[PDB]
Coordinates of C-alpha atoms and ligand atoms in Angstrom, one line a residue:
Chain A
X1 CA 14.6 45.7 -54.5
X2 CA 17.0 48.4 -54.0
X3 CA 20.5 48.3 -55.5
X4 CA 22.4 48.3 -52.4
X5 CA 20.6 45.2 -50.9
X6 CA 20.6 43.5 -54.4
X7 CA 24.3 43.8 -54.7
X8 CA 24.7 42.7 -51.0
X9 CA 23.0 39.4 -51.8
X10 CA 24.0 39.0 -55.4
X11 CA 26.5 36.0 -54.6
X12 CA 25.1 32.5 -54.5
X13 CA 26.4 32.0 -50.8
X14 CA 27.8 34.0 -47.9
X15 CA 31.1 32.4 -48.5
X16 CA 31.2 33.8 -52.1
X17 CA 29.8 37.4 -50.8
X18 CA 32.5 38.0 -48.3
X19 CA 36.2 38.7 -49.3
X20 CA 38.1 35.5 -49.5
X21 CA 40.7 36.9 -46.9
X22 CA 37.8 37.1 -44.5
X23 CA 36.3 33.8 -45.3
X24 CA 39.8 32.2 -44.5
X25 CA 39.5 33.5 -40.8
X26 CA 36.5 31.5 -39.8
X27 CA 35.9 27.7 -39.0
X28 CA 34.1 25.5 -41.5
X29 CA 31.2 25.2 -39.0
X30 CA 30.7 29.0 -39.0
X31 CA 30.9 29.2 -42.6
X32 CA 28.1 26.5 -42.9
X33 CA 25.8 28.6 -40.4
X34 CA 26.5 31.8 -42.2
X35 CA 25.7 30.4 -45.6
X36 CA 22.2 29.3 -44.3
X37 CA 21.5 32.6 -42.5
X38 CA 22.4 34.3 -45.8
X39 CA 19.8 32.0 -47.7
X40 CA 17.0 33.1 -45.2
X41 CA 17.7 36.9 -45.7
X42 CA 18.3 36.5 -49.6
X43 CA 15.0 34.7 -49.9
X44 CA 13.3 37.2 -47.6
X45 CA 14.6 40.1 -49.9
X46 CA 13.1 38.3 -52.8
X47 CA 9.9 37.7 -51.0
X48 CA 9.5 41.4 -50.2
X49 CA 10.0 42.0 -53.9
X50 CA 7.3 39.8 -54.9
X51 CA 5.0 41.6 -52.7
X52 CA 6.3 44.9 -54.3
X53 CA 5.5 43.5 -57.8
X54 CA 2.1 42.6 -56.6
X55 CA 1.3 46.1 -54.8
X56 CA 3.1 48.4 -57.2
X57 CA 3.2 46.9 -60.7
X58 CA -0.1 45.0 -60.7
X59 CA -2.6 46.4 -58.2
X60 CA -1.6 49.9 -58.5
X61 CA -1.3 49.7 -62.4
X62 CA -4.7 48.1 -62.7
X63 CA -6.2 51.0 -60.6
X64 CA -4.6 53.6 -62.7
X65 CA -5.1 52.1 -66.1
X66 CA -8.3 49.8 -66.0
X67 CA -12.0 50.3 -65.5
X68 CA -12.7 47.3 -63.4
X69 CA -15.7 47.0 -61.2
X70 CA -15.3 48.0 -57.6
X71 CA -13.9 45.2 -55.2
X72 CA -12.3 43.4 -58.3
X73 CA -8.9 44.6 -57.5
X74 CA -9.0 43.6 -53.8
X75 CA -10.3 40.2 -54.8
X76 CA -7.1 39.8 -57.1
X77 CA -4.8 40.9 -54.3
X78 CA -6.3 40.1 -51.0
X79 CA -4.2 41.4 -47.9
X80 CA -1.4 42.5 -49.9
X81 CA -0.7 45.8 -48.1
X82 CA -0.7 43.9 -44.7
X83 CA 1.6 41.3 -46.1
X84 CA 3.9 43.9 -47.4
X85 CA 4.1 45.7 -44.0
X86 CA 4.7 42.4 -42.0
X87 CA 7.6 41.4 -44.4
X88 CA 9.2 44.7 -45.0
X89 CA 9.5 45.2 -41.2
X90 CA 11.0 41.7 -40.7
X91 CA 13.4 42.1 -43.6
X92 CA 14.4 45.6 -42.1
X93 CA 15.3 43.8 -38.8
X94 CA 17.4 41.0 -40.6
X95 CA 19.3 43.8 -42.6
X96 CA 20.0 45.9 -39.6
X97 CA 21.4 42.8 -37.8
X98 CA 23.7 42.3 -40.9
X99 CA 24.7 46.0 -41.0
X100 CA 25.6 46.2 -37.3
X101 CA 27.7 43.0 -37.7
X102 CA 30.0 44.7 -40.6
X103 CA 33.7 45.1 -39.9
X104 CA 34.7 48.7 -40.0
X105 CA 35.9 49.5 -43.4
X106 CA 33.7 46.9 -45.1
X107 CA 30.4 46.8 -46.8
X108 CA 30.4 43.0 -47.1
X109 CA 32.2 41.0 -44.4
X110 CA 30.0 40.2 -41.3
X111 CA 29.0 37.3 -39.2
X112 CA 25.6 37.1 -37.5
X113 CA 25.8 35.2 -34.1
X114 CA 22.4 36.0 -32.7
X115 CA 19.8 35.4 -35.0
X116 CA 17.5 33.4 -32.8
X117 CA 16.3 36.3 -30.7
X118 CA 15.1 38.1 -33.7
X119 CA 13.3 35.1 -34.9
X120 CA 11.6 34.5 -31.4
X121 CA 10.5 38.2 -31.6
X122 CA 9.1 37.8 -35.2
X123 CA 7.2 34.6 -34.4
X124 CA 5.7 35.5 -30.8
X125 CA 3.5 38.0 -29.4
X126 CA 1.3 40.7 -31.6
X127 CA 3.7 40.0 -34.5
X128 CA 2.7 36.6 -34.7
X129 CA -0.8 37.0 -34.2
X130 CA -0.8 39.6 -37.2
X131 CA 1.0 37.0 -39.2
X132 CA -1.6 34.3 -38.4
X133 CA -4.6 36.5 -39.0
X134 CA -3.1 37.8 -42.2
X135 CA -2.1 34.2 -43.7
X136 CA -5.4 32.8 -42.7
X137 CA -7.2 35.4 -44.6
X138 CA -5.0 35.3 -47.7
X139 CA -4.7 31.7 -47.9
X140 CA -8.6 31.3 -47.6
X141 CA -9.0 33.9 -50.5
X142 CA -6.2 32.1 -52.8
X143 CA -8.6 30.0 -55.0
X144 CA -11.1 33.0 -55.3
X145 CA -8.1 35.4 -56.5
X146 CA -6.9 32.7 -59.1
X147 CA -10.5 32.2 -60.6
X148 CA -11.2 36.1 -60.7
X149 CA -7.8 36.6 -62.4
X150 CA -8.7 33.6 -65.1
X151 CA -12.0 35.1 -65.8
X152 CA -10.9 38.6 -66.3
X153 CA -7.8 37.5 -68.6
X154 CA -10.3 35.5 -70.9
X155 CA -13.2 38.1 -71.1
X156 CA -11.6 41.4 -70.7
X157 CA -9.4 42.5 -73.8
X158 CA -8.0 45.6 -71.9
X159 CA -7.1 43.4 -69.0
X160 CA -5.2 40.9 -71.1
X161 CA -3.4 43.6 -72.8
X162 CA -2.3 45.3 -69.5
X163 CA -0.9 42.0 -68.1
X164 CA 0.9 41.2 -71.5
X165 CA 2.4 44.7 -71.2
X166 CA 3.7 44.7 -67.7
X167 CA 4.8 41.1 -67.5
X168 CA 6.7 41.2 -71.0
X169 CA 10.2 42.2 -69.4
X170 CA 12.5 39.3 -68.8
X171 CA 12.9 40.3 -65.2
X172 CA 9.1 39.4 -64.6
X173 CA 9.4 35.8 -66.1
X174 CA 8.8 34.0 -62.8
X175 CA 6.2 36.6 -61.6
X176 CA 2.9 36.6 -63.2
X177 CA -0.1 37.3 -61.1
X178 CA -0.9 33.7 -60.2
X179 CA 3.0 32.8 -59.6
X180 CA 3.1 35.7 -57.3
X181 CA 0.1 34.5 -55.3
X182 CA 1.6 30.9 -55.1
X183 CA 5.1 32.3 -54.1
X184 CA 3.5 34.2 -51.1
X185 CA 1.4 31.3 -50.0
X186 CA 4.5 28.9 -50.0
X187 CA 6.7 31.4 -48.1
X188 CA 5.5 30.6 -44.8
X189 CA 6.3 26.9 -45.0
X190 CA 9.9 27.5 -46.1
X191 CA 10.7 29.0 -42.6
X192 CA 10.9 25.6 -40.7
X193 CA 13.3 24.2 -43.2
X194 CA 15.7 27.2 -43.1
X195 CA 15.5 27.5 -39.3
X196 CA 16.3 23.8 -38.8
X197 CA 19.2 24.0 -41.0
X198 CA 20.5 27.1 -39.2
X199 CA 20.0 25.4 -36.0
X200 CA 22.1 22.2 -37.1
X201 CA 25.1 24.6 -37.4
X202 CA 24.5 26.7 -34.2
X203 CA 25.6 24.3 -31.4
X204 CA 28.7 26.3 -30.6
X205 CA 26.7 28.8 -28.4
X206 CA 24.4 27.0 -26.2
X207 CA 22.0 30.1 -25.7
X208 CA 21.9 30.4 -29.5
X209 CA 20.9 26.8 -29.9
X210 CA 18.2 27.1 -27.3
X211 CA 16.9 30.3 -28.9
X212 CA 16.7 28.8 -32.4
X213 CA 14.9 25.8 -30.9
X214 CA 12.4 28.1 -29.4
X215 CA 12.0 30.1 -32.6
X216 CA 11.4 26.7 -34.6
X217 CA 8.7 25.7 -32.3
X218 CA 7.0 29.1 -32.5
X219 CA 7.0 29.1 -36.2
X220 CA 5.4 25.4 -36.3
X221 CA 2.7 26.7 -33.9
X222 CA 2.0 29.5 -36.4
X223 CA 1.7 27.3 -39.3
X224 CA -0.5 24.8 -37.6
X225 CA -2.8 27.7 -36.6
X226 CA -3.0 29.2 -40.1
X227 CA -3.5 25.5 -41.7
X228 CA -6.3 25.0 -39.3
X229 CA -7.9 28.4 -40.0
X230 CA -8.2 28.0 -43.8
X231 CA -11.5 27.4 -45.6
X232 CA -11.5 28.3 -49.3
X233 CA -13.9 31.1 -50.2
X234 CA -15.9 30.7 -53.4
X235 CA -17.7 33.4 -55.3
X236 CA -21.5 32.5 -55.6
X237 CA -21.2 29.7 -52.9
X238 CA -24.5 29.4 -51.2
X239 CA -25.1 29.3 -47.5
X240 CA -26.4 25.8 -47.6
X241 CA -23.0 24.7 -49.4
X242 CA -21.1 26.4 -46.4
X243 CA -23.1 25.1 -43.3
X244 CA -23.0 21.7 -44.9
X245 CA -19.1 21.6 -44.9
Chain B
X1 CA 6.1 29.1 -76.4
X2 CA 3.0 27.8 -74.6
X3 CA 3.3 27.9 -70.7
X4 CA 2.6 24.6 -68.6
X5 CA 2.9 24.2 -64.9
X6 CA 4.7 21.1 -63.0
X7 CA 4.4 20.4 -59.3
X8 CA 6.9 17.8 -57.8
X9 CA 5.3 15.8 -54.8
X10 CA 6.7 13.1 -52.5
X11 CA 8.1 12.6 -48.9
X12 CA 10.4 15.0 -47.3
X13 CA 13.5 12.7 -47.9
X14 CA 12.6 12.1 -51.4
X15 CA 15.0 14.6 -53.1
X16 CA 12.4 16.7 -54.8
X17 CA 14.1 20.2 -53.8
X18 CA 17.5 18.9 -55.1
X19 CA 16.1 17.6 -58.2
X20 CA 14.6 21.1 -59.0
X21 CA 17.8 22.9 -58.1
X22 CA 20.0 20.6 -60.3
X23 CA 17.7 20.8 -63.2
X24 CA 17.2 24.7 -63.2
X25 CA 21.0 25.3 -63.0
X26 CA 22.1 22.3 -65.1
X27 CA 24.6 21.6 -62.3
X28 CA 24.8 20.2 -58.9
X29 CA 26.0 23.2 -56.7
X30 CA 29.7 23.2 -56.0
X31 CA 29.8 25.7 -53.1
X32 CA 26.5 25.7 -51.4
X33 CA 23.4 23.5 -52.1
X34 CA 20.3 25.6 -51.1
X35 CA 17.8 24.7 -48.6
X36 CA 14.7 25.8 -50.5
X37 CA 13.6 26.3 -54.1
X38 CA 11.3 29.4 -54.8
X39 CA 10.2 28.8 -58.5
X40 CA 11.7 28.7 -62.0
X41 CA 10.4 28.9 -65.6
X42 CA 12.5 26.6 -67.8
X43 CA 12.9 27.1 -71.6
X44 CA 12.4 23.6 -72.9
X45 CA 12.2 22.4 -76.5
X46 CA 11.1 18.8 -76.8
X47 CA 10.2 17.0 -80.1
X48 CA 10.4 20.4 -82.0
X49 CA 7.8 22.1 -79.7
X50 CA 8.9 25.1 -77.3
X51 CA 7.3 25.4 -74.0
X52 CA 7.9 27.5 -70.9
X53 CA 7.7 25.1 -67.9
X54 CA 6.9 26.7 -64.5
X55 CA 8.5 24.6 -61.8
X56 CA 7.2 24.2 -58.2
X57 CA 8.1 22.3 -55.1
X58 CA 5.8 21.0 -52.3
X59 CA 8.7 20.8 -49.6
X60 CA 7.6 22.1 -46.3
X61 CA 3.9 21.6 -46.9
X62 CA 3.9 17.8 -46.1
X63 CA 2.4 18.4 -42.5
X64 CA -0.2 21.0 -43.7
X65 CA -3.3 19.6 -45.5
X66 CA -5.0 22.9 -46.0
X67 CA -1.9 24.8 -47.3
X68 CA -0.6 22.0 -49.4
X69 CA -3.3 21.7 -52.1
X70 CA -2.9 25.5 -52.7
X71 CA 0.0 24.4 -54.8
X72 CA -2.2 22.1 -57.3
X73 CA -4.4 24.6 -59.3
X74 CA -3.9 24.4 -62.9
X75 CA -1.0 21.8 -62.8
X76 CA -0.3 20.2 -66.2
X77 CA 2.0 17.5 -65.1
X78 CA 3.0 15.9 -61.6
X79 CA 6.3 14.3 -60.8
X80 CA 5.6 12.1 -57.9
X81 CA 9.0 11.3 -56.4
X82 CA 10.5 8.6 -54.1
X83 CA 14.0 7.9 -53.1
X84 CA 15.7 4.5 -54.3
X85 CA 17.6 4.5 -50.9
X86 CA 14.3 4.6 -49.1
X87 CA 11.7 1.9 -49.5
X88 CA 9.6 3.8 -46.9
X89 CA 9.2 6.8 -49.4
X90 CA 8.0 4.2 -52.1
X91 CA 5.4 2.9 -49.6
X92 CA 3.7 6.2 -49.1
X93 CA 3.1 6.4 -52.8
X94 CA -0.1 4.5 -53.5
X95 CA -2.4 5.3 -50.5
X96 CA -1.2 8.7 -49.5
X97 CA 0.2 10.8 -52.3
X98 CA -1.6 9.2 -55.3
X99 CA -5.3 9.6 -54.0
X100 CA -4.3 13.2 -53.0
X101 CA -3.0 14.1 -56.5
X102 CA -5.9 12.4 -58.2
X103 CA -8.4 14.2 -56.3
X104 CA -6.8 17.7 -56.7
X105 CA -5.3 17.3 -60.2
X106 CA -8.0 14.9 -61.9
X107 CA -6.7 13.5 -65.5
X108 CA -3.3 15.1 -65.1
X109 CA -0.4 12.8 -66.0
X110 CA 1.9 11.5 -63.1
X111 CA 5.4 10.4 -63.8
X112 CA 6.7 8.3 -61.0
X113 CA 10.5 9.2 -60.5
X114 CA 12.9 7.2 -58.6
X115 CA 15.5 9.8 -57.2
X116 CA 19.1 8.9 -55.9
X117 CA 19.7 6.1 -58.4
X118 CA 23.4 6.6 -57.6
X119 CA 22.9 5.0 -54.0
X120 CA 21.4 1.7 -55.3
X121 CA 25.0 0.2 -55.3
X122 CA 26.5 2.3 -52.5
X123 CA 28.0 0.0 -49.7
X124 CA 27.1 2.5 -46.9
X125 CA 23.4 2.7 -48.1
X126 CA 23.1 -1.2 -48.3
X127 CA 24.4 -1.5 -44.9
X128 CA 22.2 1.0 -43.2
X129 CA 19.1 -0.4 -44.8
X130 CA 19.9 -4.0 -43.8
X131 CA 19.7 -3.0 -40.2
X132 CA 16.0 -2.4 -40.8
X133 CA 15.6 -5.7 -42.8
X134 CA 15.5 -3.4 -45.9
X135 CA 17.4 -2.9 -49.5
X136 CA 17.5 -0.2 -52.1
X137 CA 14.5 -0.1 -54.4
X138 CA 14.9 -2.3 -57.3
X139 CA 13.9 -0.9 -60.9
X140 CA 11.1 -3.6 -61.3
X141 CA 9.7 -2.5 -57.9
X142 CA 9.5 1.1 -59.2
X143 CA 8.0 0.2 -62.6
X144 CA 5.3 -2.2 -60.8
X145 CA 4.4 0.9 -58.4
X146 CA 4.0 3.2 -61.4
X147 CA 1.9 0.6 -63.1
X148 CA -0.4 0.1 -60.2
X149 CA -0.8 3.7 -59.4
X150 CA -1.9 4.5 -63.2
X151 CA 1.1 6.5 -63.8
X152 CA 2.0 8.1 -67.3
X153 CA 5.5 6.4 -66.9
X154 CA 8.4 5.5 -64.7
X155 CA 11.9 7.0 -64.8
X156 CA 14.9 7.2 -62.5
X157 CA 17.6 9.8 -62.0
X158 CA 20.5 11.0 -59.9
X159 CA 20.7 14.7 -58.9
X160 CA 24.1 14.2 -57.5
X161 CA 25.5 13.0 -61.0
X162 CA 22.9 14.8 -63.1
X163 CA 22.3 11.4 -65.1
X164 CA 18.7 11.1 -66.2
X165 CA 17.7 14.7 -64.9
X166 CA 17.3 16.3 -68.3
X167 CA 15.4 13.2 -69.6
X168 CA 12.8 13.5 -66.8
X169 CA 11.9 17.2 -67.4
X170 CA 11.7 16.7 -71.3
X171 CA 9.4 13.7 -70.8
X172 CA 7.2 15.9 -68.3
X173 CA 7.1 18.6 -70.8
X174 CA 5.8 16.0 -73.5
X175 CA 3.3 14.7 -70.9
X176 CA 1.9 18.1 -70.2
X177 CA 1.5 18.8 -73.9
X178 CA -0.7 15.8 -74.4
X179 CA -4.5 16.3 -74.7
Ligands
LFO1 C1 -5.1 35.6 -30.4 N1 -5.0 35.0 -31.7 C2 -4.0 34.3 -32.4 O1 -4.2 33.8 -33.2 C3 -2.5 34.2 -32.0 C4 -1.9 34.8 -30.7 N2 -0.4 34.5 -30.8 C5 0.5 34.9 -29.9 C6 -0.3 33.6 -31.8 C7 1.0 32.9 -32.3 C8 0.9 32.1 -33.2 C9 -0.4 31.8 -34.1 C10 -1.5 32.5 -33.7 C11 -1.5 33.3 -32.5
LFO2 C1 25.0 18.4 -44.2 N1 24.1 19.1 -45.1 C2 22.7 19.4 -44.7 O1 22.4 19.1 -43.7 C3 21.8 19.8 -45.8 C4 22.0 20.1 -47.1 N2 20.8 20.7 -47.7 C5 20.7 20.9 -49.0 C6 19.9 20.6 -46.6 C7 18.5 21.0 -46.9 C8 17.8 21.0 -45.7 C9 18.3 20.6 -44.6 C10 19.7 20.1 -44.3 C11 20.3 20.1 -45.5
LFO3 C1 -5.4 16.9 -48.2 N1 -6.5 16.1 -48.7 C2 -7.9 16.6 -48.9 O1 -8.2 17.6 -48.7 C3 -9.1 15.5 -49.6 C4 -10.3 15.9 -49.6 N2 -10.8 14.9 -50.2 C5 -12.2 14.7 -50.5 C6 -9.9 13.9 -50.6 C7 -10.1 12.7 -51.5 C8 -8.8 11.9 -51.6 C9 -7.6 12.4 -51.3 C10 -7.6 13.6 -50.6 C11 -8.7 14.3 -50.4
LFO4 C1 -2.7 -3.0 -55.8 N1 -3.5 -2.9 -57.0 C2 -2.7 -3.3 -58.3 O1 -3.3 -3.1 -59.4 C3 -1.2 -3.8 -58.3 C4 -0.6 -4.3 -57.4 N2 0.7 -4.7 -57.9 C5 1.8 -5.1 -57.2 C6 0.8 -4.2 -59.2 C7 1.9 -4.2 -60.2 C8 1.7 -3.8 -61.6 C9 0.2 -3.3 -61.9 C10 -0.6 -3.2 -61.0 C11 -0.4 -3.8 -59.7

């Protein structure tokens, strides 16, 4: 992540990110809603950072330093460029909504009142179709990526040394290859929990309550479609094993 | 420091997310309790052995039967949670969660954990449950369920007061280290 966004989301909550004199101006219900919206954006920033570790540190590092057989790097990191484009675009929209909401003279005091419309846009139309297509492909290739990683780590000296080198820094403690893959697979199922809690504190404006109710329904339809479109791929599985599913 | 993986399972109301949050911060959040848990790698020393224990939550995956099992590969220990204020969460352990964990995590130790033990003697909880002809889970009901499902052991904790939380994760680490 870039320093400006890391500092804007360094605090454990929106109530600790804004100036205390600005916090004092809002009612408790507004503070509760803003704290959950801040968690959705903060966790989206971290999810985009996970995808940048996968594309820049791991994938690009393996292409530039190791002599792997063709198709091996794509097998370890399926769909990572498409996932990076989807979420960097979504994060850009969330951060622009926050930036427009800033008070003049401040880089930290804001209230986002209209998130629902942004979530409906993300989770409908062509962007929802692309999220469904990409996650159905990624999640169906998840077992295969983990197995290929385990094989290379145990049999290839140079691969093991590369992984130990780039994952040595303390800032990579939670972000080994297999950990990144599961953080990405689990991201999509965090959205309903976050949206439902924002909705619980968004009754003050009826149009906002209706828009977040619509967004929650669209996210659950996307998740149901991805879940029904998954079938784990296995290297070396024969056609007979497949058509006898 | 050897690396081990822990996964927590249980119904949406079992308190699994709060349990991981409180353990990972050694604190019940004073200002904001997070809605979700990403992951964490805890440095734990148990009985003289140093382990890096990776922690994962299954919250949000309960309705998605093809996404949920992607959390299980290479798990070394399972915490299977229920809430003591919810006999309904305990009823879903033996024939829903247990056969799933035994299928995807064969031979992995399961610790059955009764969460929210601070509510066993809470007047409001006892009043609400009595309307559905129910009462908080008794410790013998928890132990008998753990015995029935082939659990490695039975433990209780309260994420609210932190009591029992450290003990659950130190025991999970010991279970993960066993042959
Ligand atoms: C055309 N094929 C598709 O899969 C989808 C199209 N829309 C709009 C979706 C929304 C949620 C989930 C899937 C789709
Ligand atoms: C009044 N407080 C609440 O409603 C919540 C508190 N946490 C941590 C939640 C997580 C998911 C959904 C709702 C909540
Ligand atoms: C989500 N659960 C599955 O996909 C399962 C597939 N088999 C064969 C099972 C056996 C016992 C328990 C669960 C499963
Ligand atoms: C249903 N199958 C069983 O084996 C058990 C049932 N109850 C109540 C038990 C208590 C302790 C140990 C085993 C069981």
